[PDB]
Coordinates of C-alpha atoms in Angstrom, one line a residue:
Chain A
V1 CA 71.3 183.8 189.8
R2 CA 74.6 182.6 191.2
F3 CA 77.6 180.8 189.7
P4 CA 81.1 179.9 191.2
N5 CA 84.0 182.3 191.1
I6 CA 85.2 183.0 187.5
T7 CA 88.6 181.4 187.3
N8 CA 90.9 179.6 184.9
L9 CA 90.1 182.1 182.1
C10 CA 91.3 181.3 178.6
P11 CA 94.7 182.8 177.8
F12 CA 93.4 185.2 175.2
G13 CA 95.9 187.8 176.2
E14 CA 98.8 185.5 175.3
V15 CA 97.6 185.6 171.6
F16 CA 96.6 189.3 171.1
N17 CA 99.4 190.7 173.2
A18 CA 102.1 188.3 171.8
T19 CA 105.5 189.9 171.3
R20 CA 105.8 188.2 168.0
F21 CA 103.4 187.7 165.1
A22 CA 103.5 184.6 162.8
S23 CA 103.9 184.9 159.1
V24 CA 100.9 184.8 156.7
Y25 CA 102.0 181.4 155.2
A26 CA 103.0 180.1 158.7
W27 CA 100.2 181.4 160.9
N28 CA 100.5 180.3 164.5
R29 CA 97.6 178.0 165.7
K30 CA 96.8 177.8 169.4
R31 CA 94.2 175.6 171.0
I32 CA 92.0 176.8 173.9
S33 CA 89.8 174.4 175.9
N34 CA 88.5 173.8 179.4
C35 CA 88.8 177.5 180.2
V36 CA 86.5 180.5 180.7
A37 CA 86.4 182.5 177.4
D38 CA 86.4 186.2 178.4
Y39 CA 84.9 187.1 175.0
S40 CA 83.3 190.3 176.4
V41 CA 86.7 191.9 177.1
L42 CA 87.7 191.6 173.5
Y43 CA 84.2 192.5 172.2
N44 CA 84.2 195.8 174.2
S45 CA 87.8 196.5 173.5
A46 CA 88.3 199.4 171.0
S47 CA 91.9 198.4 170.1
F48 CA 90.6 196.3 167.2
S49 CA 90.0 197.8 163.7
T50 CA 88.2 194.8 162.2
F51 CA 85.9 192.6 164.2
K52 CA 83.9 190.2 162.0
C53 CA 81.9 187.3 163.5
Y54 CA 80.4 184.6 161.2
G55 CA 77.8 182.2 162.6
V56 CA 77.8 183.8 166.1
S57 CA 76.4 187.0 167.5
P58 CA 79.3 189.3 168.7
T59 CA 77.1 190.4 171.6
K60 CA 76.0 186.9 172.6
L61 CA 79.0 184.7 171.8
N62 CA 79.8 184.5 175.5
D63 CA 76.7 182.3 175.9
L64 CA 77.9 179.8 173.2
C65 CA 79.9 176.7 174.3
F66 CA 82.3 174.9 171.9
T67 CA 84.6 171.9 172.2
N68 CA 87.6 174.0 171.4
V69 CA 88.7 177.4 170.2
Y70 CA 91.5 177.6 167.5
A71 CA 93.3 180.9 167.4
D72 CA 95.1 181.4 164.1
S73 CA 97.3 184.5 164.6
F74 CA 99.4 186.1 161.9
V75 CA 100.6 189.5 160.6
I76 CA 99.5 190.6 157.1
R77 CA 99.2 193.8 155.1
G78 CA 96.3 196.2 155.4
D79 CA 95.1 195.5 151.8
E80 CA 95.0 191.8 152.6
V81 CA 93.0 192.4 155.8
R82 CA 89.8 192.1 153.8
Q83 CA 91.1 188.8 152.4
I84 CA 90.6 187.1 155.8
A85 CA 86.9 186.2 155.3
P86 CA 84.9 183.1 154.3
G87 CA 84.5 182.8 150.6
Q88 CA 87.3 185.3 149.9
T89 CA 89.9 185.0 147.3
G90 CA 93.5 186.3 146.9
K91 CA 97.1 185.3 147.4
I92 CA 96.8 185.0 151.2
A93 CA 93.3 183.6 151.0
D94 CA 94.4 180.8 148.7
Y95 CA 98.1 180.1 149.5
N96 CA 98.8 181.6 153.0
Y97 CA 95.6 181.2 155.0
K98 CA 92.4 179.7 153.6
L99 CA 89.1 180.0 155.4
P100 CA 86.1 177.7 154.6
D101 CA 83.0 179.2 153.1
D102 CA 80.9 178.0 156.1
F103 CA 83.5 179.1 158.7
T104 CA 82.1 179.8 162.2
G105 CA 84.1 182.1 164.4
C106 CA 85.3 185.6 164.9
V107 CA 88.2 187.4 163.2
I108 CA 89.8 190.3 165.0
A109 CA 92.4 192.4 163.2
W110 CA 94.2 195.5 164.4
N111 CA 96.9 197.6 162.8
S112 CA 100.4 196.9 164.2
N113 CA 102.4 199.6 162.4
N114 CA 103.7 201.0 165.7
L115 CA 104.7 197.5 166.8
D116 CA 105.6 195.4 163.7
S117 CA 106.8 197.9 161.1
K118 CA 110.5 198.8 161.2
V119 CA 112.4 201.8 159.7
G120 CA 114.6 199.5 157.7
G121 CA 111.7 197.3 156.6
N122 CA 110.4 194.3 158.7
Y123 CA 110.8 191.4 156.3
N124 CA 110.3 188.8 159.0
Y125 CA 106.8 188.1 157.8
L126 CA 106.5 186.0 154.6
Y127 CA 103.4 185.0 152.6
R128 CA 103.0 182.3 150.0
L129 CA 102.9 183.7 146.5
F130 CA 103.4 180.8 144.0
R131 CA 101.9 177.4 144.6
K132 CA 100.7 174.4 142.6
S133 CA 97.1 174.8 143.7
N134 CA 95.0 176.8 146.2
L135 CA 95.3 175.7 149.8
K136 CA 92.5 173.8 151.6
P137 CA 90.6 175.6 154.3
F138 CA 92.6 175.8 157.6
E139 CA 95.6 174.2 155.8
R140 CA 99.1 175.3 156.9
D141 CA 101.7 175.0 154.1
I142 CA 105.3 176.0 154.8
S143 CA 107.2 174.4 151.9
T144 CA 110.3 176.3 151.0
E145 CA 111.0 174.5 147.7
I146 CA 111.5 176.8 144.7
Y147 CA 108.3 177.0 142.7
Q148 CA 108.5 175.7 139.2
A149 CA 106.2 177.7 137.0
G150 CA 107.0 175.5 133.9
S151 CA 108.2 172.0 133.3
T152 CA 111.9 172.8 133.6
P153 CA 113.1 171.4 137.0
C154 CA 114.6 174.1 139.2
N155 CA 117.2 171.7 140.8
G156 CA 117.5 174.1 143.7
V157 CA 118.8 176.9 141.5
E158 CA 116.7 180.1 140.9
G159 CA 116.2 181.2 137.3
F160 CA 113.7 181.2 134.5
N161 CA 110.3 179.8 135.7
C162 CA 111.9 179.3 139.1
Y163 CA 110.7 181.8 141.6
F164 CA 110.7 181.7 145.4
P165 CA 107.1 180.9 146.6
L166 CA 107.5 183.1 149.6
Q167 CA 107.5 186.9 149.5
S168 CA 108.4 189.2 152.3
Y169 CA 106.4 192.3 153.3
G170 CA 107.9 195.7 153.3
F171 CA 106.5 196.9 156.6
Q172 CA 107.6 200.4 157.4
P173 CA 106.2 203.2 159.6
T174 CA 106.1 205.5 156.6
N175 CA 104.1 202.9 154.6
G176 CA 100.4 203.4 153.8
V177 CA 97.4 202.0 155.6
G178 CA 97.2 199.1 153.1
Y179 CA 100.9 198.5 153.4
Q180 CA 101.1 198.9 157.1
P181 CA 101.5 195.6 159.1
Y182 CA 98.3 194.5 160.9
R183 CA 98.0 191.6 163.3
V184 CA 95.0 189.4 162.6
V185 CA 93.8 186.5 164.9
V186 CA 90.9 184.3 163.8
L187 CA 89.1 182.4 166.6
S188 CA 87.4 179.3 165.1
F189 CA 84.9 177.5 167.2
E190 CA 85.1 173.7 167.0
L191 CA 82.1 171.9 168.3
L192 CA 82.2 168.1 168.1
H193 CA 80.8 165.2 170.2
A194 CA 82.5 166.5 173.3
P195 CA 81.4 168.0 176.6
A196 CA 82.6 171.4 175.3
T197 CA 84.1 172.7 178.5
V198 CA 85.1 176.0 176.7
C199 CA 82.4 178.5 177.7
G200 CA 82.0 182.2 178.4
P201 CA 81.6 183.9 181.8
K202 CA 78.6 183.4 183.9
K203 CA 76.8 186.3 185.6
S204 CA 76.5 186.5 189.3
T205 CA 74.0 188.4 191.5
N206 CA 73.8 189.4 195.2
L207 CA 72.2 187.0 197.5
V208 CA 68.8 187.7 199.1
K209 CA 67.4 186.0 202.2
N210 CA 63.9 185.8 203.8
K211 CA 62.1 186.8 200.6
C212 CA 60.3 185.0 197.8
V213 CA 62.9 185.1 195.0
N214 CA 63.5 183.2 191.7
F215 CA 66.8 181.4 192.4
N216 CA 69.1 179.9 189.9
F217 CA 72.1 178.1 191.3
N218 CA 74.1 176.7 188.4
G219 CA 71.6 174.2 186.9
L220 CA 69.0 174.2 189.7
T221 CA 66.2 176.7 189.2
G222 CA 63.2 177.4 191.3
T223 CA 61.3 179.9 193.3
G224 CA 61.1 180.2 197.1
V225 CA 62.5 181.7 200.3
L226 CA 66.2 181.1 201.2
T227 CA 67.0 180.9 204.9
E228 CA 70.0 179.9 206.9
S229 CA 70.5 176.1 207.2
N230 CA 71.6 174.1 210.2
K231 CA 72.3 171.0 208.1
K232 CA 75.8 169.7 207.1
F233 CA 76.7 168.8 203.6
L234 CA 79.4 166.5 202.4
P235 CA 82.3 168.3 200.7
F236 CA 81.5 167.1 197.2
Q237 CA 77.7 167.4 197.6
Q238 CA 76.0 170.5 196.1
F239 CA 72.3 170.3 197.1
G240 CA 70.0 168.2 199.2
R241 CA 66.8 166.5 198.3
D242 CA 63.8 165.5 200.4
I243 CA 62.1 162.1 200.6
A244 CA 59.7 163.2 197.9
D245 CA 62.3 164.0 195.3
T246 CA 62.1 167.7 196.1
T247 CA 65.1 170.0 196.6
Chain B
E1 CA 132.5 186.1 134.5
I2 CA 131.7 183.7 131.6
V3 CA 132.2 185.2 128.2
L4 CA 131.1 183.6 124.9
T5 CA 132.1 184.2 121.3
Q6 CA 130.0 183.3 118.2
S7 CA 130.3 182.9 114.5
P8 CA 132.1 185.8 112.7
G9 CA 130.5 188.9 111.2
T10 CA 128.7 189.5 107.9
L11 CA 128.5 186.1 106.3
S12 CA 126.4 185.8 103.1
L13 CA 125.0 182.5 101.9
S14 CA 122.8 181.7 98.9
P15 CA 119.2 181.0 99.7
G16 CA 118.1 177.3 99.6
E17 CA 121.3 175.8 100.9
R18 CA 122.6 174.6 104.3
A19 CA 123.7 177.3 106.8
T20 CA 125.5 176.6 110.0
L21 CA 126.3 178.9 112.9
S22 CA 128.6 178.3 115.9
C23 CA 129.0 179.5 119.5
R24 CA 132.0 178.7 121.8
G25 CA 132.6 179.7 125.4
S26 CA 135.7 180.0 127.4
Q27 CA 134.1 178.1 130.3
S28 CA 131.9 175.1 130.3
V29 CA 128.1 175.6 130.7
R30 CA 125.1 173.4 131.2
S31 CA 123.1 172.4 128.1
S32 CA 119.7 172.2 130.0
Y33 CA 119.9 176.0 130.4
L34 CA 120.9 176.9 126.8
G35 CA 119.2 178.9 124.1
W36 CA 119.7 180.2 120.6
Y37 CA 117.4 182.9 119.4
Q38 CA 116.8 185.1 116.3
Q39 CA 116.4 188.8 115.8
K40 CA 115.5 190.7 112.6
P41 CA 117.6 193.8 111.7
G42 CA 115.2 196.3 113.2
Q43 CA 112.8 194.2 115.4
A44 CA 112.8 192.4 118.7
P45 CA 114.5 189.0 119.1
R46 CA 112.6 185.7 118.9
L47 CA 113.4 182.4 120.6
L48 CA 114.4 179.7 118.2
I49 CA 115.9 176.7 120.1
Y50 CA 116.0 176.0 123.8
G51 CA 117.9 173.2 125.5
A52 CA 119.5 172.1 122.1
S53 CA 116.8 169.3 121.9
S54 CA 113.4 171.1 122.2
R55 CA 111.8 173.1 119.4
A56 CA 110.5 176.5 120.5
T57 CA 106.9 177.5 119.9
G58 CA 106.3 179.2 116.5
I59 CA 109.5 177.9 115.0
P60 CA 109.6 176.0 111.7
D61 CA 110.8 172.4 111.7
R62 CA 113.6 173.2 109.3
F63 CA 115.5 175.0 112.1
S64 CA 117.7 172.7 114.3
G65 CA 120.1 173.4 117.2
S66 CA 122.6 171.1 118.9
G67 CA 126.0 171.1 120.6
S68 CA 127.9 169.9 123.6
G69 CA 130.6 171.0 126.0
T70 CA 131.5 174.5 125.2
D71 CA 130.7 174.3 121.4
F72 CA 127.1 174.6 120.2
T73 CA 125.6 175.1 116.7
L74 CA 122.5 176.1 114.9
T75 CA 121.6 174.8 111.4
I76 CA 119.0 175.7 108.8
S77 CA 118.7 173.3 105.8
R78 CA 116.8 175.5 103.3
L79 CA 117.0 179.3 103.5
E80 CA 113.8 181.3 103.2
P81 CA 113.4 185.1 102.9
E82 CA 112.5 185.0 106.6
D83 CA 116.1 183.9 107.4
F84 CA 117.7 187.4 106.9
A85 CA 118.3 187.9 110.6
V86 CA 120.9 187.8 113.4
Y87 CA 121.3 184.8 115.7
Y88 CA 122.2 184.9 119.4
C89 CA 123.7 182.4 121.8
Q90 CA 122.8 182.4 125.5
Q91 CA 122.9 180.4 128.7
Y92 CA 120.1 181.1 131.3
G93 CA 120.8 179.2 134.5
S94 CA 122.0 181.1 137.6
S95 CA 122.9 184.8 138.2
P96 CA 125.3 185.3 135.2
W97 CA 123.3 185.9 131.9
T98 CA 125.4 185.9 128.7
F99 CA 123.3 187.2 125.7
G100 CA 124.2 186.5 122.1
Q101 CA 127.2 187.9 120.3
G102 CA 125.3 188.3 117.0
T103 CA 125.5 186.4 113.7
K104 CA 123.8 188.0 110.6
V105 CA 122.6 185.4 108.2
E106 CA 122.2 187.7 105.1
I107 CA 120.8 187.7 101.6
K108 CA 122.9 187.5 98.4
Chain C
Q1 CA 98.9 185.1 123.2
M2 CA 100.0 187.9 125.6
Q3 CA 100.6 191.6 124.9
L4 CA 103.2 193.9 126.4
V5 CA 102.9 197.7 126.4
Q6 CA 105.8 200.2 126.4
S7 CA 106.3 203.9 125.7
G8 CA 106.4 205.4 122.2
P9 CA 108.8 207.8 120.6
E10 CA 111.3 209.6 122.8
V11 CA 113.8 212.5 122.1
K12 CA 116.0 213.5 125.0
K13 CA 119.2 215.4 126.0
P14 CA 122.3 213.8 127.6
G15 CA 122.3 213.6 131.4
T16 CA 118.5 213.3 131.8
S17 CA 117.3 210.3 133.9
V18 CA 114.9 208.8 131.4
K19 CA 111.9 207.0 132.7
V20 CA 110.2 204.1 130.8
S21 CA 107.4 201.7 131.8
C22 CA 106.5 198.2 130.7
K23 CA 103.1 196.6 131.4
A24 CA 101.7 193.2 130.6
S25 CA 98.3 191.8 129.7
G26 CA 96.9 188.4 128.7
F27 CA 98.8 186.4 131.3
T28 CA 99.1 186.4 135.1
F29 CA 101.6 189.2 135.9
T30 CA 101.9 188.1 139.6
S31 CA 105.5 187.3 140.1
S32 CA 106.9 186.6 136.6
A33 CA 110.2 188.2 135.9
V34 CA 110.8 191.0 133.4
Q35 CA 113.9 191.1 131.3
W36 CA 115.1 194.3 129.6
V37 CA 117.0 194.8 126.3
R38 CA 118.7 197.8 124.7
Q39 CA 119.9 198.1 121.2
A40 CA 121.3 201.0 119.1
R41 CA 120.4 201.7 115.5
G42 CA 121.3 198.5 113.6
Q43 CA 124.0 197.9 116.3
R44 CA 124.4 194.7 118.2
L45 CA 122.7 194.5 121.5
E46 CA 124.0 193.5 125.0
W47 CA 122.6 192.6 128.4
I48 CA 120.7 194.9 130.7
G49 CA 119.2 192.6 133.3
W50 CA 116.0 191.5 134.8
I51 CA 113.6 192.3 137.7
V52 CA 111.5 190.0 139.9
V53 CA 108.2 191.9 140.0
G54 CA 106.7 189.8 142.8
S55 CA 109.3 191.1 145.3
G56 CA 111.0 193.7 143.1
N57 CA 114.4 191.9 143.1
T58 CA 116.7 193.8 140.7
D59 CA 119.6 192.2 138.7
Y60 CA 121.8 194.1 136.3
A61 CA 125.2 193.9 134.5
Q62 CA 128.6 195.0 135.9
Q63 CA 128.3 198.2 133.8
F64 CA 124.6 199.1 134.5
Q65 CA 124.8 199.4 138.3
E66 CA 124.4 202.9 139.9
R67 CA 122.7 204.2 136.7
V68 CA 119.6 202.0 136.2
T69 CA 116.9 201.3 138.8
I70 CA 113.4 199.7 138.5
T71 CA 110.3 199.8 140.6
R72 CA 107.1 197.7 140.7
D73 CA 103.4 198.5 140.5
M74 CA 101.0 195.6 141.0
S75 CA 98.0 198.0 140.5
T76 CA 98.6 198.3 136.8
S77 CA 101.0 195.4 136.7
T78 CA 103.9 197.5 135.4
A79 CA 107.7 197.5 135.8
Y80 CA 109.0 201.1 135.9
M81 CA 112.7 201.4 135.0
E82 CA 114.8 204.5 134.8
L83 CA 118.3 205.3 133.6
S84 CA 120.7 208.1 134.8
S85 CA 123.8 209.7 133.4
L86 CA 123.2 209.1 129.7
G87 CA 125.4 210.1 126.8
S88 CA 125.2 211.6 123.3
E89 CA 126.1 208.3 121.8
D90 CA 123.4 206.4 123.7
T91 CA 120.7 206.7 121.0
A92 CA 119.0 203.3 121.0
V93 CA 115.7 201.5 121.5
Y94 CA 114.6 199.7 124.6
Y95 CA 112.4 196.5 124.8
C96 CA 111.0 194.5 127.6
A97 CA 110.0 190.8 127.7
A98 CA 108.3 188.5 130.2
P99 CA 108.3 184.7 130.1
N100 CA 105.6 184.0 127.4
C101 CA 103.3 181.6 129.2
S102 CA 99.6 181.5 130.0
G103 CA 98.3 180.7 133.5
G104 CA 100.1 179.4 136.5
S105 CA 101.2 176.1 134.9
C106 CA 102.6 177.5 131.7
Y107 CA 105.5 177.3 129.2
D108 CA 109.1 178.5 129.5
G109 CA 110.0 180.7 126.5
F110 CA 110.2 184.4 126.0
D111 CA 108.2 184.6 122.8
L112 CA 106.2 187.9 122.4
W113 CA 107.1 191.5 122.3
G114 CA 106.3 194.9 123.7
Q115 CA 106.0 198.1 121.6
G116 CA 109.6 199.5 121.9
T117 CA 110.8 202.8 123.2
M118 CA 113.0 204.8 120.8
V119 CA 115.5 207.0 122.7
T120 CA 117.0 209.6 120.3
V121 CA 119.7 212.0 121.6
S122 CA 120.9 215.1 119.9
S123 CA 122.9 218.0 121.4
Chain D
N1 CA 100.7 143.9 184.6
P2 CA 98.8 142.4 181.8
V3 CA 96.6 144.4 179.5
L4 CA 93.0 144.2 180.7
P5 CA 89.8 145.1 178.9
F6 CA 87.4 147.9 180.0
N7 CA 83.8 147.0 179.3
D8 CA 81.6 149.4 181.2
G9 CA 83.5 150.3 184.4
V10 CA 86.6 149.1 186.2
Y11 CA 87.0 148.7 189.9
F12 CA 90.6 148.6 191.1
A13 CA 91.6 147.6 194.6
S14 CA 95.1 147.6 196.1
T15 CA 96.4 146.6 199.5
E16 CA 99.8 148.4 199.4
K17 CA 102.0 150.1 202.0
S18 CA 105.0 151.0 199.7
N19 CA 102.8 152.7 197.1
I20 CA 104.3 150.4 194.4
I21 CA 101.3 150.7 192.0
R22 CA 101.0 154.4 191.1
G23 CA 99.8 154.6 187.5
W24 CA 97.1 153.7 185.1
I25 CA 96.7 153.7 181.3
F26 CA 93.4 153.9 179.4
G27 CA 92.6 153.7 175.7
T28 CA 91.9 151.4 172.8
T29 CA 95.0 151.1 170.6
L30 CA 97.6 152.4 173.0
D31 CA 100.0 152.8 170.1
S32 CA 99.6 156.6 169.2
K33 CA 96.9 155.6 166.7
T34 CA 94.1 156.9 168.9
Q35 CA 93.8 159.1 172.0
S36 CA 95.1 157.6 175.2
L37 CA 95.0 158.7 178.8
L38 CA 97.9 158.2 181.3
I39 CA 97.7 158.9 185.0
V40 CA 100.8 158.9 187.2
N41 CA 100.7 159.7 191.0
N42 CA 104.3 160.4 191.9
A43 CA 105.5 162.1 195.0
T44 CA 102.9 164.8 195.8
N45 CA 101.7 165.3 192.3
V46 CA 99.1 163.4 190.3
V47 CA 99.5 164.1 186.6
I48 CA 96.9 163.0 184.0
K49 CA 97.7 163.5 180.4
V50 CA 95.4 162.7 177.5
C51 CA 97.5 162.6 174.3
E52 CA 98.3 160.3 171.4
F53 CA 100.7 158.1 173.3
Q54 CA 103.1 155.5 171.7
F55 CA 103.2 153.3 174.8
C56 CA 106.0 150.8 175.3
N57 CA 105.3 147.0 175.0
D58 CA 106.1 146.5 178.7
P59 CA 105.7 149.9 180.5
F60 CA 107.3 150.1 183.9
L61 CA 108.4 152.6 186.6
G62 CA 111.7 152.8 188.4
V63 CA 112.6 153.0 192.0
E64 CA 113.2 155.9 186.0
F65 CA 110.1 156.4 183.8
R66 CA 109.6 154.0 180.8
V67 CA 105.9 154.0 179.8
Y68 CA 105.6 155.5 176.4
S69 CA 108.0 156.4 173.5
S70 CA 106.3 159.6 172.3
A71 CA 103.3 161.8 173.1
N72 CA 101.9 163.6 170.0
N73 CA 98.7 165.7 169.7
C74 CA 97.8 166.1 173.3
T75 CA 94.2 166.9 174.1
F76 CA 94.1 167.3 177.8
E77 CA 96.3 167.8 180.9
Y78 CA 95.6 168.0 184.6
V79 CA 97.7 168.2 187.8
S80 CA 96.5 167.6 191.3
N81 CA 96.9 150.7 203.2
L82 CA 93.8 149.8 201.3
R83 CA 93.0 152.0 198.2
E84 CA 89.9 151.5 196.1
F85 CA 89.2 153.2 192.8
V86 CA 86.3 153.2 190.3
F87 CA 86.8 154.4 186.7
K88 CA 83.8 154.8 184.3
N89 CA 83.3 156.7 181.1
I90 CA 79.7 157.9 180.7
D91 CA 78.5 160.4 178.1
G92 CA 82.0 161.6 177.3
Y93 CA 82.8 162.1 181.0
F94 CA 85.5 160.0 182.6
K95 CA 84.6 159.8 186.3
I96 CA 87.1 158.6 188.8
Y97 CA 86.0 157.8 192.4
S98 CA 88.6 157.1 195.1
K99 CA 88.7 155.9 198.7
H100 CA 91.5 155.3 201.1
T101 CA 91.1 153.1 204.2
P102 CA 93.3 151.4 206.7
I103 CA 94.2 147.8 205.8
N104 CA 94.1 144.9 208.3
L105 CA 94.6 142.0 205.9
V106 CA 97.7 140.8 204.1
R107 CA 96.5 139.2 200.9
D108 CA 92.7 139.3 201.2
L109 CA 89.9 141.7 200.7
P110 CA 88.4 142.8 204.1
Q111 CA 84.7 142.0 204.5
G112 CA 83.6 145.6 205.3
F113 CA 81.7 148.5 203.7
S114 CA 83.2 151.8 202.6
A115 CA 81.7 154.2 200.0
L116 CA 84.0 155.6 197.3
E117 CA 83.8 159.4 197.3
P118 CA 84.0 161.1 193.9
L119 CA 87.4 162.4 193.0
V120 CA 87.4 163.8 189.5
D121 CA 85.2 164.0 186.4
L122 CA 87.3 164.7 183.4
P123 CA 85.3 166.1 180.4
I124 CA 87.3 164.1 177.9
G125 CA 85.7 162.3 174.9
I126 CA 88.0 159.2 174.7
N127 CA 86.8 155.7 173.8
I128 CA 88.2 153.4 176.4
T129 CA 88.2 149.6 175.9
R130 CA 91.4 148.3 177.5
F131 CA 93.5 149.4 180.5
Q132 CA 96.8 148.5 182.1
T133 CA 98.3 149.4 185.5
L134 CA 101.7 151.0 186.2
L135 CA 103.9 149.8 189.0
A136 CA 107.1 151.1 190.5
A137 CA 102.6 143.6 195.7
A138 CA 99.1 142.6 194.5
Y139 CA 95.8 144.0 193.4
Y140 CA 92.3 143.1 192.5
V141 CA 90.2 143.9 189.4
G142 CA 86.4 143.8 189.0
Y143 CA 83.9 144.8 186.3
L144 CA 80.8 146.8 186.9
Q145 CA 77.3 145.8 185.7
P146 CA 74.0 147.8 185.2
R147 CA 72.3 146.8 188.4
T148 CA 69.8 148.3 190.9
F149 CA 71.0 148.9 194.5
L150 CA 69.3 150.2 197.6
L151 CA 71.5 152.5 199.7

């Protein structure tokens, strides 16, 4: 079985190896399409502490094609790591990052204490704490208005029943596992009425001549003997057909 | 900071008659963030009036509170044996919080 | 209605950094503030301050800095406040109060009570 | 450069020596309401962008770029005498076939035969009903039909 050279791979490294991680309430969404999804590299990588795939087999997701891949990347606490799951509830699951119950995709989370935690406390990550209602699945809310717990208007002034909806994380190297910062990226697979150019890598095998073999060139499959050809093809043509509709 | 002063100390009034208590501040405050609240001599305080126009939950209708500018007042028309207490004046907007100065409505 | 829980009787010696907790039940203790009050025996009370339990944001008086500090515990939903450098004339009782309101869309007042912590000092 | 409909397939022909016509626009609304495709072949670069384009009422090119006012929610991007092009959207694939030949006529279509070799097959799911050309001259427009041919 033979396929063209694997090129134009999806920029998965640009998300996982990003120098900055988005906030829980302001998770960074990246779209990947028309590229080779090197899913096996992430699957075999041991740098991830949590690797949960819903609706797709972790060992066979490279064989699944989707219209697009949406990478939602953020930094959260360890205790909130379990909150990133379909059907889950919590502060982050309802106000910062909400996942649908029937979500299809893979969530990969890894501790980033050595990279995100700071001695003085890394407060650059903020999560929504107070909100009027639970956020919709895959909904990004970044409103900074002071939350009004009661009927008294805040008028831009903090006070009774007027608390800031966003809370910062106390990420420190001396913090516990549940309090240590962890970077979580959820790859959601969107499949609509599209050609779905986003696909995983295709295996390639060494070529054999002058022997009955089962050959698979891209979409053309058959069995026969492959020999050197003296014919000339047009640059855009891939295979030649005989007068009896036979390759 | 802002400092308030309230009705003077140890005033005794006969039960069943009108009683009025006053609170005045050196600096002007906002009425939307105002509150008068009661505290028995030996028990936690209880909110009575907030905003000078809204009656607080669990408060009888006979209690009323009002005022404007720097001068605010609290009135009870008929005194009950549940009125032997101390009343406090406070504003609760931004960072400065000025709790009550204390006014003991007593029993003859 | 809600229900606040504090410590019980307390007899101490001057100079001891006293430690008092205040927990809540019956309403969502997620990020609602907690306001603290101290009052001596029959004596008029003054202002201690308040704490934002969601992020642990402390606010105190001009006289209660560098001697009071408060921490947060979401596990038992408790505010843990301590005093340092007390005195022989500091016998009092301490109360805590959260905005009395049920649910996320609730009222505004501070209606209900705790249990009260009596701090008695002698010698 | 009037707005022209796209029924099943558009055949464009140009007899140009100054490369005046070097752009094409495809879509339905062409007002950022729906996805739109814009192709511009400038200098040595042919750039095709599929985005929500707020196209101008009278787009034109300088000798200056005034085609659209804004480009929100992009979905695709690609960079790569007588000129003949065929554009057709089949099964969510926008196929563009191109051919370049010498021109021996001034304002007429030479009576010869030349096959249009395939150029690109963009896997873009865009509903195309109208199209308009982009010019920095004359050209010819034809509409394809589902017919049977012997080659």
